[PDB]
RNA sequence: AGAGAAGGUCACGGCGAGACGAGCCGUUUAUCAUUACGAUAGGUGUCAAGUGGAAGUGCAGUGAUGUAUGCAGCUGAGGCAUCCUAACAGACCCACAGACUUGAAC
RNA sequence: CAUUGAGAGGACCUUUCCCUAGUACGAGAGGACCGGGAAGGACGCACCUCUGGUGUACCAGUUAUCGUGCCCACGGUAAACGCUGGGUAGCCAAGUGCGGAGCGGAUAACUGCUGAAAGCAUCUAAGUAGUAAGCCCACCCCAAGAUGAGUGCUCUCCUA
RNA sequence: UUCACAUCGACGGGAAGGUUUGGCACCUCGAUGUCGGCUCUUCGCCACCUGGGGCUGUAGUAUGUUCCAAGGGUUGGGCUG
RNA sequence: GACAACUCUCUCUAAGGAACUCGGCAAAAUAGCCCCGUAACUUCGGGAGAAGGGGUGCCCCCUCGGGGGUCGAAGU
């Protein structure tokens, strides 16, 4: 099965934005994690 | 599906997964702490403890059971030596699991399994 | 679990050694002969010089299965072979003397057959 | 006061003690030759006598079960008995056979000879 | 769906076998109970538009509850409770908030019940398992096997129909089981044994009502 | 603008929920003294259950092998106990008394 | 949090046998309508107590062979079980339960009652009565994105 | 048997359908392709069975024919492209 | 990592046993060795490993194959 047409500039821009939104949740996990390791109180976590 | 299938597959077939787990335990009992992947660690808990509980009784029977799990004799004998001393009062729970920054190459979540 | 093409041992005198079930009757469209159902069989192997010729279409009731019958005692029965007894459309067995065990599950529709039994289960 | 998993196990213990009170049940393993007497809901006069070897024993609760094989008129018959059943009257061990398995399912494939009793 | 009679909620504990004097073995589900089955709220036709009674079931620590809900159960003057549910009656005069239900009062022996529960989730399931599609040939040349088949007609209509049966997620839903029977009630363990199977695995949550019979327990229309 | 409402998401331990999201349950593990509600997973202890009689040492035997110690040994995805390990540390979103008009009430 | 239900769907299926009664009917042979009761089929919804299937979680035998110094005893390999014999939990059916209720509403054909236009007649023009596995509600899941976005209970809106 | 119209209905006529065998060549030629099975639907009614009826040359059982009715059903094999 | 549908490479499957299908296609079954036995037909060479049957592990004892024991559900 192929693409009978070519995908319109704007619609593609939306699909790719969706795929870029995942970076946003990973940025929240990353931020929360740094704020954890930045109090040095976690015994479950370790860094070297 | 799996409902109440509890085993850790580690994304390997039966043979390999066995051999892997045996290996990882002779490693943990040799070095006392190691760095692995979160799944491997969690899976390895059970077998670590099987070995320790094994050594706590000390019978020739048990010693032959452990010998036939761990790969290296020397580590087994040392186990049966140390364990009554070190773990005698501890009822269960012989391992600590401390997670770390994920790996660079694949971003697989890592971990530190400690003999506690 | 007798179904079409199944082969069956004959449990009586009537002069057939083996039946091949082709149908199940009174069960509407069910495909399973279980104990005490009337099946239409044909005769494959026969006992020579007897009223019954091979390649005959006949009726039989199923007295033995390798599947398991459940009574209400929680009691269960499993034979080692499949067997049926050759009958009339009246419920009377064509042959006059029966082999093997049977069950009290057949007592309702067939009197004759439970009568002639060497054993009842 | 009873926690719930407890309830599940407990109801089986209750039913089996209440059943072993009326009618004490023998120690019965695999490979035992056994005689059983059933009270049938019809035919009050005589109680049906089943003999035979025990091919298997499945342990569950009150519904714990016994499988009896015997050759009858040259046709092999296996029969399954709920042990704590009210419709059973007497059960006893006639003799013991020496067997190495937990279930003898291999008796089907063997000769009639081994299934022959009485 | 106006319901005949107040129901109660219970918890499936699993199944066992249960004898009768004559040696009839009946498989029964054992339905346990927990502290609860307390009428929470009552709804008048005037106020709410209809007649119903909300019974809470499973008790609980107060922390785990949310402030809106805790404040719902202090208006009632009842203990903290996990699951609330409603029963729809045609007459509610007999019920006050804080009043308690006993299942020994509502259910006798040999009575008919209706067990509503949530089903075992089997996940995302194929066409076979979900709708009982006959599978296609396993061997001579055939490349299909467990596949869905053709899904519609040709050029006309030229689109698949609505609700045409397809692989999707199966199980995990509210399911009624009509007209069961109650074999025995144990006051000692406060348990109810029921002939037959009820949905979902032990530790489930069940809702039992006196069975609706479309002629005789219900509004005619 | 400071702060973090009720609540949510995340994180963390999980599942009879699950392709992923979602769902549901947990997150210091109570106290009790008369009920229940404060053990999520793993481990450990015990029990159901399975398999079917461990290893070692005895005896019998020329020996293969049998027999005793012993419903043994192993297993225990299931129950019940017990905080021994991990539920640490935490992060993010989020708080114009609810535009405007008209009647009714006071 | 709990729900109302516009709308949408699933399912409302069918066979033998037994009472009625060997009664009506007929010279006999044959043999009922109507209404009750059981067992079946197919289909649907669940389920694992039993009977099982699998169960590369486990347990046992056993061949070849290489390891653990050697006997003993275990380990590996014989693809993704070396080959066999068992199996719990799970999932599953051939196993187990349950379902198809309505002296509810309105009709199609048809049978009807009062009864004119045509002082007679006529089920129809007024008005009304029975009556179908059909139609619609009731049953079972979904469902306020039902933008017509519903109702109900409770909670919260700090500081300067 | 009597009786055209229970059931048939000769000689002829008036129609509907668009499922057979055809006429046409409006259609597509580049890679818009015929008959059977499998799986999976779905709809029509000219109703095979199941629900209700009228007539019978319907005593009864069973038919015949026709009316309303498409909710549900419509087996398994030996044989054929 | 997780352990959905589905496709592929594989193991197993209660009762039945070709009912499948264009067609037993694919699977399953058989199998080594020693011993007994071996048809129509024939160009007398064959057919023929026809078919069909039995035995087989591990120990001791005898003769240089025979007897006795012993495990296993099953011994190439
Ligand atoms: Mg291997
Ligand atoms: Mg490999
Ligand atoms: Mg364990
Ligand atoms: Mg012939
Ligand atoms: Mg005699
Ligand atoms: Mg069992
Ligand atoms: Mg022996
Ligand atoms: Mg699930
Ligand atoms: Mg098929
Ligand atoms: Mg294929
Ligand atoms: Mg279009
Ligand atoms: Mg807050
Ligand atoms: Mg999580
Ligand atoms: Mg979430
Ligand atoms: Mg915390
Ligand atoms: Mg635990
Ligand atoms: Mg647990
Ligand atoms: Mg020993
Ligand atoms: Mg061993
Ligand atoms: Mg000796
Ligand atoms: Mg045991
Ligand atoms: Mg405690
Ligand atoms: Mg801790
Ligand atoms: Mg205002
Ligand atoms: Mg204003
Ligand atoms: Mg809630
Ligand atoms: Mg609702
Ligand atoms: Mg509606
Ligand atoms: Mg809509
Ligand atoms: Mg509807
Ligand atoms: Mg209806
Ligand atoms: Mg008469
Ligand atoms: Mg009737
Ligand atoms: Mg029925
Ligand atoms: Mg089961
Ligand atoms: Mg079970
Ligand atoms: Mg098996
Ligand atoms: Mg099982
Ligand atoms: Mg060596
Ligand atoms: Mg060696
Ligand atoms: Mg090995
Ligand atoms: Mg190697
Ligand atoms: Mg190789
Ligand atoms: Mg292989
Ligand atoms: Mg196996
Ligand atoms: Mg059923
Ligand atoms: Mg009506
Ligand atoms: Mg009318
Ligand atoms: Mg009329
Ligand atoms: Mg008049
Ligand atoms: Mg009139
Ligand atoms: Mg009118
Ligand atoms: Mg109707
Ligand atoms: Mg009906
Ligand atoms: Mg809303
Ligand atoms: Mg608006
Ligand atoms: Mg409005
Ligand atoms: Mg005319
Ligand atoms: Mg042209
Ligand atoms: Mg094209
Ligand atoms: Mg018509
Ligand atoms: Mg009709
Ligand atoms: Mg008619
Ligand atoms: Mg007549
Ligand atoms: Mg129809
Ligand atoms: Mg239709
Ligand atoms: Mg049709
Ligand atoms: Mg046909
Ligand atoms: Mg995979
Ligand atoms: Mg099979
Ligand atoms: Mg078989
Ligand atoms: Mg077989
Ligand atoms: Mg055969
Ligand atoms: Mg043929
Ligand atoms: Mg064929
Ligand atoms: Mg065919
Ligand atoms: Mg081939
Ligand atoms: Mg092969
Ligand atoms: Mg095989
Ligand atoms: Mg051989
Ligand atoms: Mg072989
Ligand atoms: Mg010769
Ligand atoms: Mg010759
Ligand atoms: Mg020759
Ligand atoms: Mg030839
Ligand atoms: Mg030769
Ligand atoms: Mg040969
Ligand atoms: Mg030849
Ligand atoms: Mg041979
Ligand atoms: Mg042989
Ligand atoms: Mg031998
Ligand atoms: Mg000897
Ligand atoms: Mg010998
Ligand atoms: Mg032997
Ligand atoms: Mg032998």
Curated annotation (Swiss-Prot), chain A:
It comes from the Eukaryota. One of its GO terms (biological process) is translation. GO terms for molecular function: structural constituent of ribosome. It is found in: Plastid, Chloroplast. Keywords: Chloroplast, Plastid, Ribonucleoprotein, Ribosomal protein. GO terms for cellular component: chloroplast; large ribosomal subunit. Component of the chloroplast large ribosomal subunit (LSU). Mature 70S chloroplast ribosomes of higher plants consist of a small (30S) and a large (50S) subunit. The 30S small subunit contains 1 molecule of ribosomal RNA (16S rRNA) and 24 different proteins. The 50S large subunit contains 3 rRNA molecules (23S, 5S and 4.5S rRNA) and 33 different proteins. Belongs to the bacterial ribosomal protein bL32 family. This is Large ribosomal subunit protein bL32c. It comes from Spinacia oleracea. The lineage of its organism: Eukaryota, Viridiplantae, Streptophyta, Embryophyta, Tracheophyta. The chain holds residues 2 to 49 of 57 of the full protein.
UniProtKB/Swiss-Prot annotation, chain B:
The gene is RPL17. Belongs to the bacterial ribosomal protein bL17 family. It holds the Pfam family Ribosomal_L17. This is Large ribosomal subunit protein bL17c. Keywords: Chloroplast, Plastid, Ribonucleoprotein, Ribosomal protein, RNA-binding, rRNA-binding, Transit peptide. The lineage of its organism: Eukaryota, Viridiplantae, Streptophyta, Embryophyta, Tracheophyta. It comes from Spinacia oleracea (Spinach). It is found in: Plastid, Chloroplast. GO terms for molecular function: rRNA binding; structural constituent of ribosome. GO terms for biological process: translation. Component of the chloroplast ribosome (chloro-ribosome), a dedicated translation machinery responsible for the synthesis of chloroplast genome-encoded proteins, including proteins of the transcription and translation machinery and components of the photosynthetic apparatus. Component of the chloroplast large ribosomal subunit (LSU). Mature 70S chloroplast ribosomes of higher plants consist of a small (30S) and a large (50S) subunit. The 30S small subunit contains 1 molecule of ribosomal RNA (16S rRNA) and 24 different proteins. The 50S large subunit contains 3 rRNA molecules (23S, 5S and 4.5S rRNA) and 33 different proteins. It comes from the Eukaryota. GO terms for cellular component: chloroplast; cytosolic large ribosomal subunit.
From Swiss-Prot, chain C:
GO terms for cellular component: chloroplast; cytosolic large ribosomal subunit. It comes from the Eukaryota. GO terms for biological process: translation. GO terms for molecular function: large ribosomal subunit rRNA binding; structural constituent of ribosome. The keyword Ribosomal protein applies. The keyword Ribosomal protein applies. Keywords: Chloroplast, Plastid, Ribonucleoprotein, Ribosomal protein, RNA-binding, rRNA-binding. It is found in: Plastid, Chloroplast. InterPro entries: Ribosomal_uL14, Ribosomal_uL14_bac-type, Ribosomal_uL14_CS, Ribosomal_uL14_sf. Component of the chloroplast large ribosomal subunit (LSU). Mature 70S chloroplast ribosomes of higher plants consist of a small (30S) and a large (50S) subunit. The 30S small subunit contains 1 molecule of ribosomal RNA (16S rRNA) and 24 different proteins. The 50S large subunit contains 3 rRNA molecules (23S, 5S and 4.5S rRNA) and 33 different proteins. HAMAP family: Ribosomal_uL14. Belongs to the universal ribosomal protein uL14 family. This is Large ribosomal subunit protein uL14c. It comes from Spinacia oleracea (Spinach).
Swiss-Prot record, chain E:
It comes from the Eukaryota. GO terms for cellular component: chloroplast envelope; ribonucleoprotein complex; ribosome. It is found in: Plastid, Chloroplast. GO terms for biological process: translation. Keywords: Chloroplast, Plastid, Ribonucleoprotein, Ribosomal protein, RNA-binding, rRNA-binding, Transit peptide. One of its GO terms (molecular function) is rRNA binding. Residues 144-172 are annotated as: Disordered. Belongs to the universal ribosomal protein uL3 family. Component of the chloroplast large ribosomal subunit (LSU). Mature 70S chloroplast ribosomes of higher plants consist of a small (30S) and a large (50S) subunit. The 30S small subunit contains 1 molecule of ribosomal RNA (16S rRNA) and 24 different proteins. The 50S large subunit contains 3 rRNA molecules (23S, 5S and 4.5S rRNA) and 33 different proteins. Component of the chloroplast ribosome (chloro-ribosome), a dedicated translation machinery responsible for the synthesis of chloroplast genome-encoded proteins, including proteins of the transcription and translation machinery and components of the photosynthetic apparatus. This is Large ribosomal subunit protein uL3c. It comes from Spinacia oleracea. The lineage of its organism: Eukaryota, Viridiplantae, Streptophyta, Embryophyta, Tracheophyta. The gene is RPL3. The chain holds residues 85 to 305 of 305 of the full protein.
